[PDB]
């Protein structure tokens with residue numbers, strides 16, 4: 001904000017952030033992989049119809065689901081509405097390249 | 100008050116029906132879109148994910164919600180019933196307006 005002077009008061013100029021151009025997708029509370037439920041560290045899981053990604057809450061920026069940005073807590077038999085997608089781990093390609 | 104010689108009473112600009120409609124609109128917006136409608140266009144989101152957002156806001160991970168959803172829902176319903184019973188218990192809670 002920026003202040004301005006008035007003859008008998010004060011004038012405030014407030015700069016704010018307003019989102020626009022919304023779009024809707026399909027979401028799931030968690031991902032079940034190898035019998036383990038994965039939850040996002042930040043953001044939510046969204047899908048465009050064929051693949052699942054991770055985006056921010058207030059901005060759309062799809063990312064490949066990875067162990068780096070997800071954490072595991074228990075099995076996937078308790079969470080209601082879980083889906084059955086897979087996750088990615090770059091350590092396996094890193095190990096494969098060391099041959 | 101009453102009607103008699105000397106003075107008169109004026110009706111309010113907004114009727115009770117309009118106030119009830121405003122409250123209903125606020126309730127629908129806050130239970131169908133979270134806090135997104137308070138800053139711009141309303142964005143739909145399932146209620147469980149909004150509750151997970153709020154739990155992450157208060158400093159607790161969302162997995163404890165996803166593993167204890169039924170208990171929290173039952174506690175909320177019991178609390179609503181208890182508020183109804185307490186309000187119908189003829190308690191002196193409405194004394195602020197009566198005074």
Ligand SMILES: *[C@@H]1O[C@H](CO)[C@@H](O)[C@H](O)[C@H]1NC(C)=O
Nearest residue numbers: 022023024025026047048049
């Ligand atoms: C998104 O919203 C529009 C209009 O509300 C609806 O027609 C559509 O089915 C929704 N879902 C997708 C995936 O577009």
Ligand SMILES: *[C@@H]1O[C@H](CO)[C@@H](O)[C@H](O)[C@H]1NC(C)=O
Nearest residue numbers: 047048049050051052053062
């Ligand atoms: C969803 O995004 C993927 C990109 O990984 C793309 O290959 C696929 O065609 C997209 N599906 C639709 C229905 O747009």
Ligand SMILES: *[C@@H]1O[C@H](CO)[C@@H](O)[C@H](O)[C@H]1NC(C)=O
Nearest residue numbers: 032033034035082083084085
């Ligand atoms: C999820 O995928 C696993 C893969 O082994 C399978 O055993 C399980 O039945 C699947 N569950 C559902 C609900 O599709």
